[PDB]
Amino acid sequence: MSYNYVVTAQKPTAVNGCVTGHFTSAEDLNLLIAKNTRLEIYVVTAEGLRPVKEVGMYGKIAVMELFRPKGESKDLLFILTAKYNACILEYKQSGESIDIITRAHGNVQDRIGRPSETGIIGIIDPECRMIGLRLYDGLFKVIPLDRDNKELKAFNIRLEELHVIDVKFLYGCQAPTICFVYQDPQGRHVKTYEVSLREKEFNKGPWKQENVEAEASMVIAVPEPFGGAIIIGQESITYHNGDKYLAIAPPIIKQSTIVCHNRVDPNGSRYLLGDMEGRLFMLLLEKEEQMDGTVTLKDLRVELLGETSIAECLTYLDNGVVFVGSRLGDSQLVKLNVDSNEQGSYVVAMETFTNLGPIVDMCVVDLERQGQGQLVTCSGAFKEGSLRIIRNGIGIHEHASIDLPGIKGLWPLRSDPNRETYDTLVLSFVGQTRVLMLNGEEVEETELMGFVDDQQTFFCGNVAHQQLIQITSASVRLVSQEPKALVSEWKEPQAKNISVASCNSSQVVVAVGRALYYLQIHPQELRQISHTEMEHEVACLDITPLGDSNGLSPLCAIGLWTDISARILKLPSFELLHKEMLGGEIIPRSILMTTFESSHYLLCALGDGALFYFGLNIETGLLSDRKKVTLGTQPTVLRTFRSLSTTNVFACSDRPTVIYSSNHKLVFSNVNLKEVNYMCPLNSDGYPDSLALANNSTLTIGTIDEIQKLHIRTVPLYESPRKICYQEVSQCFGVLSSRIEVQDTSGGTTALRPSASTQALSSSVSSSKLFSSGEEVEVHNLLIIDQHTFEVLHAHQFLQNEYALSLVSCKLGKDPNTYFIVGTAMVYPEEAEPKQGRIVVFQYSDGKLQTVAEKEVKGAVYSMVEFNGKLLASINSTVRLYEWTTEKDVRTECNHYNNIMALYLKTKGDFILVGDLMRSVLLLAYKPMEGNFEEIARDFNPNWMSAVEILDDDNFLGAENAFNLFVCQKDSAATTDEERQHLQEVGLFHLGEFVNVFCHGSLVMQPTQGSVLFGTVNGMIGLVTSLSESWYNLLLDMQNRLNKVIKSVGKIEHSFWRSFHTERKTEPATGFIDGDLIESFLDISRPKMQEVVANREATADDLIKVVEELTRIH
């Protein structure tokens, strides 16, 4: 009975896989990108990448190939998951609906098999006779491809070689033929076999096993024309075919290891090569022809091309474009050119996609001091290293502040016919109209001719032919640019008000009720035209010249009262087309027609906060689809702002909201503001690219950040960050950081690039003398980072071969000072494990960093928390609890010894602790007795931890080794001396990410309990929350129901995916919930949604609003 809820706050950003080919159309170039459990499909174009389809999977993509057997229209996609979920996909567009369909699928694991060296490797023969797999040492699986085999049945074949490094099939081969470097004692070797599937056995390969080098690791299979195999090692590259043997040792590649490659030219003249260094190489094969004879090979060379991010994944695209998949850093779009610009680099970045990459540590801070957390993560490794500042919502910058308890509208207003700048904002008000002349950036309310001051304005548009409009309760009024006074005036033939006001800059359409007139602002006068009456009271109206119409506007829509409805109708005719018949007793406050790309838009706000959304037709006039959100309870006023090239839709609720554009879809991110009433684009000389926003009382004006549910602000560190503390009083951050250096010729160490520790503003080295006794080394720092500017204020450099592994920022003991404590460790490649390090206590001043105190220790200080004015601190195996002398020194009080190696600790307010490397977690107390440690309980499972957290006094989150999460609580039981020294694993769940850090924090606000965020190797930011047993239950059912309804991709079983799994063990998930899956609900059609019910009560659209009320947990 443990009840947690896990949700993705940020999908994985790292790139594990990318492949290219014609998946979409036989004529289309696709980039397939594998995230972890996300598959992105793109079309390659002139601009770069056209986003097409982003499907998710219930597994980690471990193999991703496109391939094409005979008589197949276009390419098919083969996907192997890491729980050995194999499956085949086809791209399938039903005209406008897109589907990725599973042509085949089966689970390919074997109970026998210890998974191997180089992990899963799945390859596919040129002729498409089959797929070959190396899941286990000794065996080699083969899934024969056929019309059938729809359940991917496969045999194994025993493999003499117990240690394969890499395999592929060879081109130009009568039989299927594999080629593989492999390691046994005397070095590595390259062997071959045919594959006769007729007989489920291997056949002497076309050519003798030879040798390849000690560090040989890639195998490339040069395409038909040349045929053969390329082998890459350190400093060396070699080529094999029968009795052919070319080979080079280009000093240039020795510098670092090649790591990923890509075939540039279909024929195989060229290949890209990735370095651990971020370096890009061209491998070129020099072809050779004889008259009537197939092409031989003369030579192979390596041309250094430049620098990319540390690449996992390379894919050559169109013309000099290269996609560059990175996990240690940002993935990027890259251009090769024939020439080398400044520096001599033939590489040029075109685009950069943000990868939170390895999130390694992180913390939560409301930097501006609001009540929303921003989140600050140490990311990347080596040069890609960085801080990333992550902020929910779209905020805006507040220029003036004029408290006006009323404002019931506002529109812009250039008082000069030329400039884009408006110096007025005539604001509808609580039954009046004040004008707002501006001295520039200065506020002033004066008169204006032919514009009322005692009569409430409903509009001010920007009507052409040198004039200014004012639709009032009463009459649509008129003022000129030349005349500027009385020009004309419309008035209803009865002495009767205008109810609903409209206008673009050419059209005028009003409404007396059902009455729908129509008038025009013709050169100096308002001439009348049409008239109609509708079933019911006109609630609201939208008109704007959209695409193929300057000024004068085509078709339309409207919402009336009693039927609660919105319907499609024309202009001078007013002819009714299709309609919707929305429900409830509350009317549509706002209707709007817009455009962005290739689709015209209709949206309709009701007074219950909620919105119904649809897509119209400049031509026809029909009915799109149907959904129902729930922005701010209060009615929503839809409008359009000036932003970039896809100028967007701002929605004014109690919960202000932007509506942007997704694929070509439309974003729904929060706007970071109190409450917005009405809003309009503006631009004076004194407030340009402004947006103007009235609230319960206040005019405001400002620009607008990105878009995304999340804004991410990065800080390039150029070395690899490791830990992160926010010491508030000093308005800065502490950041442990690590930079690499190479051995000199004076033997010492230099550096490979300026880092953030070398470009520090001030700086320090460790002077301390506590110890005595090409090539790479690591040099560690504490960085001091300004929270506002993100500048390395100060840098402290540690000893020689000292690694700083923990950072706290705390006051200690009586001491009113706020320290930065850093635990450290001396480390030598020889030694299995350091036997010495030191805790160091520092303070940062007006601008100074002083070594306030040190303290030797006989291990690695893996972690430390601030206990209670005491400093609790894992050392190597021991868990020690320090005290600050008033003399200001750290002195031992007690220690716990029973840990294989304490990697982690956390502290529940009271006197309670937790953590361990391999098995698993211990829970502890401090006893203000003899100030001892009593070891309360432990979990007795073999979990190699990576991250640990305390949810509450009893519940303990824990993440491990194998992408599982688990929760523990103490066994409330009789016989309290065994069943108490043991705490049971009550929540089990396969996340499918590797978790580095948990922390308490939340990214939202000014049903669930708490909020713990975690950050993963892949750039995923998730969140874990607690639940009520009842809420657990509803949701657990809702999950099971939700599955039957949902077709997974690859026909993977949701629960197979979510199941706890360490090689040696597989239970299903208990006590956990993916809201990720719950949230799936919303993306289900109302029928498939109904289904989900059949059954204190049971509804149909309650739940579709129970789900909403969760999405806003982040």
């Binding site: 690694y803 480390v827 299995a832 892949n1018």
Partner: peptide
């Protein structure tokens, strides 16, 4: 050490 190793598993593979 296991430090080169924690730090390693740190970034990933």
């Amino acid at each position: 050490s296991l430090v080169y190793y924690l730090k390693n598993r740190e970034v990933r593979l």
